[PDB]
Amino acid sequence: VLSADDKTNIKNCWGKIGGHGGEYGEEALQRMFAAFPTTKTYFSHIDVSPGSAQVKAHGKKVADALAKAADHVEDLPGALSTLSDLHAHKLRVDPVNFKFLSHCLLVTLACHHPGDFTPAMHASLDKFLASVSTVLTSK
């Protein structure tokens, strides 16, 4: 749904991550690969060991699509349709997996921003990554 309160909560958050988005997205992935090793299966083609250079590159790419979405909050199918055919059509990623990455993304933000990561904020954020997950599995 996303109220005006949700829309503006998001933009403050991505306003605050600034250029950490990259290293955050790395941490979120690194967090997913360990708490949910089932996911490692989707990345058989790259090195994935805790600290890593290909995990770093994919990391940045992820957080970019998060920056993109936050900008086009109101046109999420529009903004992310090219990542829909990638995941839903090409890779056939389980729809359960997006719940694991969204969670690890929240543990990352919550870790780095104790002041901002309030309940009210955290619901919008969850809700946001749910529609980013939705559109991602929309095909």
């Binding site: 690194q30 360990a34 708490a35 969670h103 543990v107 104790p114 309940p119 009210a120 955290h122």
Partner: protein, 145 residues
């Protein structure tokens, strides 16, 4: 549940420096805010009309202590999650009719309150150790459906 030695000392060590009473009231606190259908199950805790109403609410804090002490049991008796939670699984099934998906949801709330709480000490290694426990604790409460 695996729980290796370095995976065992991460849990009891980091659990060392959280206030359990707040982890419990805050996880229960957040769950209701982020997943509002969970309020229906707790119809008996007064009004839960807003983020404030459901955070200063003494009854939410009170319940979240009873939740954390059971979770503390989990840790003490990781040999038998199922035995420990036999009674409580029955309770949540025969008398509360809670869909088991709701367990992993709360599990997650403990997971991120821990991260919110402990800062840059909640390393990916630490998290994983806690994942397996909260996961273990979740299907413990499900084996009576």
């Amino acid at each position: 549940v695996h729980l290796t030695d370095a995976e065992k000392a991460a849990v009891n060590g980091l659990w060392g420096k959280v206030n359990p009473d707040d982890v419990g009231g805050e996880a229960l606190g957040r769950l209701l805010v982020v997943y509002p259908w969970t309020q229906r199950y707790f119809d008996s805790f007064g009004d839960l009309s807003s983020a404030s109403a459901i955070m200063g609410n003494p009854k939410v804090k009170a319940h979240g202590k009873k939740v954390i002490n059971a979770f503390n049991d989990g840790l003490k008796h990781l040999d038998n999650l199922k035995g420990t939670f036999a009674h409580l699984s029955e309770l949540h099934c025969d008398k509360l009719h809670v869909d088991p998906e709701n367990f992993r949801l709360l599990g997650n709330m403990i997971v991120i309150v821990l991260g919110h709480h402990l800062g840059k000490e909640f390393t990916p290694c630490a998290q994983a150790a806690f994942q397996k426990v909260v996961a273990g604790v979740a299907s413990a409460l499900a084996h009576k459906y």
